[PDB]
């Protein structure tokens, strides 16, 4: 069973995919909670390559890591990957006159409540979108 969420980021699909795949960029977002922060992300972005998004707490009292394997990479318009939890996660980067329609579609983990997962993923997708807006990544500039 798949749950599909979305985001209309007013930015280029280049800057959005860049912020998504770049491990140094992922270091700031990914950890939705501000009490957490991604201390490292081993990203081998190829078809069959693995990812590992280590998140440390601000006081280092705990840690939490997102391991998995990319099952399909269609740069920059789509990224398909499965997590350690079994979540088949499919993030679509669609080009639109308004910016980039990032439609995330993940498989719901049988262990957790589906709606609570959707809230967690929408938190991380908000944290990503807000990172793109915070870092700027503004390709559009008024040339003069």
UniProtKB/TrEMBL annotation:
Sequence ranges assigned to domain Activator of Hsp90 ATPase homologue 1/2-like C-terminal in this UniProt record: 13-133
Question: InterPro entries, from UniProt?
Answer: ASHA1/2-like_C, START-like_dom_sf
> What's a Pfam family this protein contains?
AHSA1
Q: This protein's superkingdom?
A: Bacteria
What CDD domains does the database record attribute to this sequence? SRPBCC_CalC_Aha1-like_4
Please give the family membership noted in the entry.
Answer: Belongs to the AHA1 family.
What name goes with this protein?
Answer: Activator of Hsp90 ATPase homologue 1/2-like C-terminal domain-containing protein
Q: Specify the species.
A: Aeromonas hydrophila subsp. hydrophila (strain ATCC 7966 / DSM 30187 / BCRC 13018 / CCUG 14551 / JCM 1027 / KCTC 2358 / NCIMB 9240 / NCTC 8049)
């Amino acid at each position: 069973m798949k749950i599909s969420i979305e985001a209309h980021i007013e930015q280029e699909i280049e800057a959005v995919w860049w912020a998504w795949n770049d491990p140094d960029c992922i270091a700031r977002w990914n950890a939705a909670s501000s009490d957490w922060h991604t201390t490292g992300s081993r990203v081998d972005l190829v078809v069959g390559g693995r990812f590992c998004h280590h998140m440390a707490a601000k006081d280092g009292s705990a840690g939490f890591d997102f391991t998995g394997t990319f099952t399909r990479v269609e740069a920059p318009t789509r990224l398909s990957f499965v997590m350690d939890d079994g979540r088949e996660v499919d993030v679509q980067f669609a080009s639109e006159p308004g910016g980039t329609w990032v439609q995330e579609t993940f498989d719901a983990e049988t262990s957790h409540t589906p709606a609570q997962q959707q809230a967690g993923w929408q938190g991380i997708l908000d944290n990503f979108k807000r990172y793109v807006e915070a870092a700027g990544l503004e390709h559009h500039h008024h040339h003069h």
